[PDB]
Amino acid sequence: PPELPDFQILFNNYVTNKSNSFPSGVIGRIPAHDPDLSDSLNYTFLQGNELSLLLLDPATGELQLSRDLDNNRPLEALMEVSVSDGIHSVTALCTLRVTIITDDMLTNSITVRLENMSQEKFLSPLLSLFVEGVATVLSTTKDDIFVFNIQNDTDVSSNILNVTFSALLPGGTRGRFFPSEDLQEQIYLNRTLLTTISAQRVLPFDDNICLREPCENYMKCVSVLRFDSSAPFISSTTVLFRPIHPITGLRCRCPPGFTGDYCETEIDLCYSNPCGANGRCRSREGGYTCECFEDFTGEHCQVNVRSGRCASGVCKNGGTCVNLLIGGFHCVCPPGEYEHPYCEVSTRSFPPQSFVTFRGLRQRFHFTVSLAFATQDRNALLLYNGRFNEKHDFIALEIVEEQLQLTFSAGETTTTVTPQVPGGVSDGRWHSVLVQYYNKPNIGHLGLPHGPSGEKVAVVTVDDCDAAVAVHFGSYVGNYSCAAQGTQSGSKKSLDLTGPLLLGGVPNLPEDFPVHSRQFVGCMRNLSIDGRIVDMAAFIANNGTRAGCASQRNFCDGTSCQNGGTCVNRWNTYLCECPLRFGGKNCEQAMPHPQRFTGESVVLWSDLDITISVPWYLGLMFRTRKEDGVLMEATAGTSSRLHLQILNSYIRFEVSYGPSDVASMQLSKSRITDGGWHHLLIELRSAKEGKDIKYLAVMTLDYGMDQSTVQIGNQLPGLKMRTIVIGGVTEDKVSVRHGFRGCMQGVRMGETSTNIATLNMNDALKVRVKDGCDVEDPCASSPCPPHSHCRDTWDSYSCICDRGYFGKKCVDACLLNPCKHVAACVRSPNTPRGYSCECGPGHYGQYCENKVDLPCPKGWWGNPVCGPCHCAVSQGFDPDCNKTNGQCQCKENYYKPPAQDACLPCDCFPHGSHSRACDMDTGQCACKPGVIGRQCNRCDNPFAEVTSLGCEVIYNGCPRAFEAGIWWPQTKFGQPAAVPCPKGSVGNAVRHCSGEKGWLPPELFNCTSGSFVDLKALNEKLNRNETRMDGNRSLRLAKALRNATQGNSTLFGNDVRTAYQLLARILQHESRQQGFDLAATREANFHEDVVHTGSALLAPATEASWEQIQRSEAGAAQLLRHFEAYFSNVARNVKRTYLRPFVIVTANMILAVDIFDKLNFTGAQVPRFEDIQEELPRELESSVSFPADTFKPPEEPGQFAVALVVIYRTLGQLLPEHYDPDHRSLRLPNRPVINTPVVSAMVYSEGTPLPSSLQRPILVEFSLLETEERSKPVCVFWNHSLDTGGTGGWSAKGCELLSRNRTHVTCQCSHSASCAVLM
C-alpha cells in the first residue's frame, strides 16, 4: 500500500528579454513511494487542472511545465492528485507557485550563512519557518519575503548553507526594496530573537571586498550582486526548487555633501540660511543644526512657543498638548522622570552588568563627542564602538588608575591618548569629556586641497582647559596637561564604524573586546553628539539600565544638623560638618580637646585589665595629610600587630598574631588624606557558627558611611587587644619614629561608645603634647609670584593665580601669542578666557583661521560662506544667480507667465515693437502705436495691417501675418487657404480668411503629428481588409499606442479617429479569444496600457474636437460595449487564470477587480476604498454597496465569485446630448445635466449562472460635480439595447432615488450595466 506527502513546487523565473531560461524536458516526478516493489501505480489528476497548466506522464509520473507558463506574471494554484495500486486509492495536494525575478530584485539582495544545516532541512519543510522568523523580525507579511537562491555552501567540508533573498519595503508603495545596509543592520540587531523564534544557529556577517579600499578619493565602495547563470531543478522528497546563481561585484558612488568630477570639495549646508533670522546655523557632516533662538522651536524652528499652538510632535514622549487660552501651549508630561518643557530624559544610572544600545555613528572623517559622568571605580569602561567582526577599526574610552584614557585604531595600529588631571577624577564628582577627530587635507600645488591627506588627528579635553596652549607648550609653562592630542598615518583614508553605539559596558560576548576593563557602575548625563543632545528614553536596547541617578539626590532636605552642623550632600547620603567638640552623625556627641601633632608627639596606654569577651569598640577622630605613619599600633596578645596606618594615603589595618601574619584589610577604596575631619570605629563582634564562636572586625568610617568587615577567622579570635599606641612608631619612649602630623580629637574605648571611661589626659602618657590645634598661616609668607591669591588649606596652600595667567609660574598666555596667522593678541581687562585674538579683515573665527573667497566662484553664491546656485538650466534659466538673495534668473529672450513655472521665449514680432524683450509675466512686447495683442500682433483696425512703417490700411485680403505660427498669406473673401501644417506636423492645415472675422478657427483635422506619421501609415492599411491581426501584433500596437499617447499634447481629429478605430479592433479581437489564447495571460501591463490610453482619449480639451467626432461615430457607446464585453470575458476566465485582485487608478478612470468567497460574503463597498490607500480626490469618493444578502439565496466549484467595477469620471458630459424621446417616460427639464461619474458594476458567479436581471438590487452612492441644489435628480441608466440612438440611452426604468444627503446620492439598480444620476 502507498502514501504521499502534500507538496509544493516553486518556479523562480528570472525573466529577461535576453535569456530563455525556461526549462524543458523532464524536471521531476510525483514524490511517490511504496514498500511494494511489484505494483504499477496509476498517476492521475482528480481536480485542480482545468487548462493543462502541467503536463503529466500517467505511467512514470513525470511532470513538465506547459508552454503557457512563459510570461512575466506571478501565480499560485492548488492541484489534487490521485495514486492507485489497482486495489487502493489515495489522494494528495500540491501547491504550485511561480515567482518573477527582475534586475531591481537582484540589485537589492543579501545573503546570510547558516551553520550545521545543509540541503536536507532547508529544502525539506523548515523554509516556511525561516520565511516567518524573517517576517517577524522585519515586522512584515510573509508575502514581502522572496527567497530566490539556496545552494550547498560546503566550501570544503563544513556544514554551512548560503541563502540569498530580498525584501519589499512596507508601506504599500510598489517598487521599493530595503537598502542593503538597512537589511544588514535590521538583521544584526534582533539576532538572538531570530535565533529563538526560528531555532537555528545564525552565523555572523563576514568582511566585505571593500576592506582593501580600492576605490578613489571621497567615493564610496558598495558590493552588489548580478546575474550569473541558472541551474536545473534540485530535487528532494517534498520540494522541487530551481535556483538562480548570482555573482558579486563592486560599485563606487559619490556620497552627498561633495562636489566635483571626483567629489574632492565639500559644501557647507548652512549657506542656504535655513535658520533664518530666528536662529543660527551649525554645520555638520551632511547636515546642520539650529541654535534657533528663544520662543522659537521646531526642526527648522518654524514654531513659536509663546504665541503658537499645539503642533504634532512638539510635546515629546506622550506629553499632552493643552492650548493656553491666551496663545501658546503646555506639554503635560506623563508622571515620570521627564524634563520640562518637552518631557525629556537626560540622566541615567548604571548598576553592574547593565548597558544600553543607541544608533551607531556614521560620520566618515570628522566628528565631535562630549558627555558628563560621575563614579568612583579606579578601573572601569566608558565607551566603545567597533564592527561586527570586532576587528580593524574601533574606538574606546576608559578610566584606568583614576585617569582618563582614549584608545583607538583605524585598522592598522592602536593609539592611546592620556591627559593627566591632578588628584584623579574618581572622586564621585561630575566631570565632562570632549573628543574631536578630523583628517588633514592634501593641499594642492594651486593651494586647493585635493582630497584628504593621510594625517588623522584626535584631541581629548577634560573639563575646563585651554587646548592650544596645553598641546603646544604646556610643559614649558609648567605642570598643565589637562588636554592631549594623538596622530595617525596610514594608507587607509577613512574611518569605518559599521557597528552600533553602546554605553555603560560591553555586552558579555564570548569574543574579547580590545578593552582593559569589562564593565562600569555610576551615573552619566548630557550625551551630546555634534551639539545635538540625545534623549536617554529614545534607546534601541536596554539590558538593565534605569533612568535617573538616585545616589545624587539632595539628601540634606528634611534633615536638621545640630549646633553648628552644616549640611552637605555626598554620594548616596549627607554629612553634617560639625564644629569642634561636637560630632556624631548630626553633631550629637562631645569630644575632648584636640591635639596638634608634628612628628614628635606620641601617646600610649598600658597597665590595663581586659579579658577576651564580646563586643569591643575602639573609636578615633582624626584629620591629617601624611601619606604614611602609624596611626594606631596595638599588640593584641603576644605580638598581634594591629597596624592601623595611612600607608600610601590609605587606611591599612593588619592583624598579625605572634610570629605569624594572620589577616589584613585596607581602605584603598577611599583616599582619606584630604585633611578633613573623619571618625572611625573598630567593632569586635561575635558570630556563632554551629557550636564555635568566631569574631568579626567591622571598622565603620564616618558612622558607617564606609564600613569594611573582615571575618575574624578562628586563629584571630580569643586574642583581645592588649596594648594601645597612637602617634607613630616608638619603643624607647624617647625617640619617635614615623611620628604623626596633623590634628586629632578625643578617643573612645570599651564595649559601647557611651562607655565613657575617660583615661585622664593628666594620667597615662603626656609627652610632646601641645594643647590646641591652631596653625600659623602658611599664606603669611605669601609665596606665589604676582597676579596671585594665596589661600590657606590647613597646612597647605595653592596659588589661585590671577586669571589670564597659566601654569605653576602663572604666566600670561597672551604674551606667548597663541593667536595664529600673525593675529594680534589683545588682553581685555575682563576676558572670560583671559585674552582675545584681534585679526584683520578677510579672516573670521576665534583664531581667524577661516578665510572668505569673495567674490564666490562662478555658480557659487553666499556670504560669508559660498554655496551652489543650483539653477535649473534645462528650463532656460541663467546659471548665474543673485550673489546675495540667491534667486535664480531666467535667461534673456524669455518671460515666465504667472501661472506657468517655466519661462517661455518672448517671440515678439520685430516689426511691431520698438524693443524686442517682452515684459515679465504679461509678455507684452513694446507695442508701437496702432498695434495691440500680447505679442503686438493685431492692428486696432481689423483691416489695417502691419508693415515696417506701421499699421497701414491694406485693401485686398488678410495680409501676411504670423498669428498662430502660420504666415497665413494673402487671401481673398470666400476663398480658404490650405498651407503646409505647422512645424513638427505634416498634412495640410487649412484656414479661411472669412470676410467677417478674418481668419476662421483653423481646421487641424487634416494636420497629423510626427509621432503618428508611422501610426497613420499603419492605420491606413488596416481598414483595407488586407493584413491580418494577431496577438503579438496586438501587444506591440498597444505598447506603441500607449507611448504615442502618453504626455500632454493636442490629439488631432485624424488621430482621434485612428485611436478609436484601433481600440475598437483590439477589443473586438480580444472578445473573440478564450482560455489562454487571451493576451491577458501573456502580459501584466496590458490592462494599464489600455486604461491609460482610454483616459487620455477622453480628455475634456477635445470637446471642440468631440462635437465634430460625435457626428461620425458612436464613440463612447461602442467603446463602452467593447469594455463591458471584454470585462465579461475577463470575469468568465478569472478563476481559470487565477488573476489576483487589483485596482487601477488614472486621472479619469477607475478599475477594480476583486474576488469574494461566496459562502462568506456579507456585502461590502466597491471599489474597496477602505482597502485603497492611494490618495483619492474627494470627488472620486463614490461607492457601490453589496448588502449582506447579496450572496444569500432569495427567500466544490462555486465557492468564489468575482466583482469588477469601472468608474468613468467625465464620460457623461462627453456623451452626445441624447435623451429618451418618450415624453411620458421622461419629462425633459429645461437644463438636464449628467452630474455623476458613470459606474459599471458586474458580478460573476461560477457554476449556476445568476439571473440576468439582478433579483436583489445593488446600491450605488454617487457624488456631485456642481454643488447647486436648484432642481431634482433622476437615477437613470444608459442602455445599449434601447432603440434610442441605436446604442441605447438614458432611462429611469428600473432605477430610482433612495436617499440624498448634502454630499451623496444613493440609488438602487437591478441591472449590472452603466448607470448614472441625471442631476
Ligand SMILES: *[C@@H]1O[C@H](CO)[C@@H](O[C@@H]2O[C@H](CO)[C@@H](O[C@@H]3O[C@H](CO)[C@@H](O)[C@H](O)[C@@H]3O)[C@H](O)[C@H]2NC(C)=O)[C@H](O)[C@H]1NC(C)=O
Ligand atoms: C526588534 O524587534 C522588535 C519587536 O520585537 C521591533 O519592535 C517594533 O518596532 C516598531 C518600530 O518602532 C514598532 O512600530 C511602532 O510602534 C509604536 C508603538 O506601538 C507605534 O506608535 C508606531 O506607530 C509603530 O507601530 C513596533 O510596535 C515594535 N514591536 C513590534 C510588535 O513589532 C524592533 O523594531 C526590532 N528591531 C530592533 C530594535 O532590533
Ligand SMILES: *[C@@H]1O[C@H](CO)[C@@H](O[C@@H]2O[C@H](CO)[C@@H](O)[C@H](O)[C@H]2NC(C)=O)[C@H](O)[C@H]1NC(C)=O
Ligand atoms: C489509469 O486511470 C485511468 C483513469 O481512470 C484509466 O482510464 C480508463 O481506461 C479505461 C479503459 O482501460 C476506460 O474504460 C475508462 O473510462 C478510463 N477512465 C478515464 C476516466 O479515463 C486507465 O485505464 C488507468 N490505467 C491503469 C494502469 O489501469
Ligand SMILES: *[C@@H]1O[C@H](CO)[C@@H](O[C@@H]2O[C@H](CO)[C@@H](O)[C@H](O)[C@H]2NC(C)=O)[C@H](O)[C@H]1NC(C)=O
Ligand atoms: C544582560 O545582563 C545580564 C546580567 O544582569 C547578563 O546575564 C549574565 O550573562 C553572563 C554571560 O552569558 C552569564 O555568565 C551570567 O550567568 C548571566 N547572569 C548573571 C547572574 O550575571 C546578560 O547576558 C546580559 N545580556 C544578554 C541578554 O546577553
Ligand SMILES: *[C@@H]1O[C@H](CO)[C@@H](O[C@@H]2O[C@H](CO)[C@@H](O)[C@H](O)[C@H]2NC(C)=O)[C@H](O)[C@H]1NC(C)=O
Ligand atoms: C547638562 O544639561 C543640563 C540640562 O538641564 C544643564 O542644566 C541647565 O544648565 C543651564 C545653563 O547653566 C541652566 O540655565 C538650566 O537651568 C539648567 N537646567 C537644569 C536645572 O538642569 C547642564 O548645565 C548641562 N551640563 C552639565 C555637565 O550638567
Ligand SMILES: *[C@@H]1O[C@H](CO)[C@@H](O)[C@H](O)[C@H]1NC(C)=O
Ligand atoms: C551538500 O553537502 C552536504 C554535506 O553534508 C551533503 O550531505 C549534501 O548531499 C550535499 N548536496 C549536494 C547536492 O551537493
Ligand SMILES: *[C@@H]1O[C@H](CO)[C@@H](O)[C@H](O)[C@H]1NC(C)=O
Ligand atoms: C610636575 O610634574 C612633575 C613630573 O615629574 C613632578 O615631578 C612635579 O613635582 C610636578 N609639580 C607639581 C607639584 O605640579
Ligand SMILES: *[C@@H]1O[C@H](CO)[C@@H](O)[C@H](O)[C@H]1NC(C)=O
Ligand atoms: C539681488 O536681489 C536684490 C533684491 O531684488 C537686489 O537688490 C540685488 O541688487 C540683487 N543682486 C544682484 C545684482 O543679483
Ligand SMILES: *[C@@H]1O[C@H](CO)[C@@H](O)[C@H](O)[C@H]1NC(C)=O
Ligand atoms: C471589409 O469587409 C467587410 C465585410 O464584407 C465590409 O463590411 C467592410 O466594409 C470591408 N472594408 C473595406 C473597406 O475593405
Ligand SMILES: *[C@@H]1O[C@H](CO)[C@@H](O)[C@H](O)[C@H]1NC(C)=O
Ligand atoms: C515614444 O515615442 C517617442 C516619440 O516618437 C520616442 O522618441 C520614444 O523613443 C518612444 N519610446 C518608446 C518607449 O517606444
Ligand SMILES: *[C@@H]1O[C@H](CO)[C@@H](O)[C@H](O)[C@H]1NC(C)=O
Ligand atoms: C502634463 O501636465 C501635468 C499637469 O500637472 C504635469 O504635471 C506634467 O508634467 C505634464 N507632462 C508633460 C510635460 O507632458
